[PDB]
Amino acid sequence: SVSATRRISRLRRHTRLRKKLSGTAERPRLVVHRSARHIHVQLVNDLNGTTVAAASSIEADVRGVPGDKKARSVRVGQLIAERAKAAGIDTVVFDRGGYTYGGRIAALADAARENGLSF
């Protein structure tokens, strides 16, 4: 199989970078989840497991943005940047999610550094 290979291989890449990157209450952790159609993102606070802010491409604001999938990654990257600042967050650590930094995720990350977050 290849669909069962890809889940096991990316949650092993996700555990490898998780040993050294955890994220706390004053510096939360921006966790991306990249599918073929959308991307989801949330700030997780790994001391009691509590998401403080979240944004996704499946809601109505990101769905009506013209262009490719990188431009919808920029739009969801601007949403969780302006939702982190409504909860008192201005510095986070960036969780790759097991993926490769580049493409849609680096377009999410660079669109969140322009709008306030300082990673």
Partner RNA sequence: GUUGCGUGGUUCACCGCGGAGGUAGAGCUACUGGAUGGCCGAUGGGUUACUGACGUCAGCCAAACUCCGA
Partner RNA sequence: UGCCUCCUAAAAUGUAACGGAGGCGCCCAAAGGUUCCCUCAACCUGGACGGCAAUCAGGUGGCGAGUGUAAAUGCACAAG
Partner RNA sequence: UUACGGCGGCCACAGCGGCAGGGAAACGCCCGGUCCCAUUCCGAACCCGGAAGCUAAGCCUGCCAGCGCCGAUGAUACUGCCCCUCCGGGUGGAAAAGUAGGACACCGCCGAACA
Q: How far apart are CA 54 and CA 80, in angstroms?
A: 6
Of the candidates 16, 90, 110, 118, which one interacts with RNA according to CB under 7 A? 16
Please give the residues from 72 up to 101 whose contact with RNA meets the rule CB under 7 A: 96-100
CB of residue 82 vs RNA: minimum separation in angstroms? 15
CB of residue 110 vs RNA: minimum separation in angstroms? 12
Residue pair 71/65 in contact (Cβ under 8 Å)? The answer is: yes
Q: For RNA, what does the binding mask look like between residues 43 and 72, x meaning CB under 7 A?
A: -x-x-xxxx--x-x-xx-------xxxx--
Question: What ranges make up the beta strands (E) of the chain?
Answer: 29-34, 39-43, 53-56, 93-95
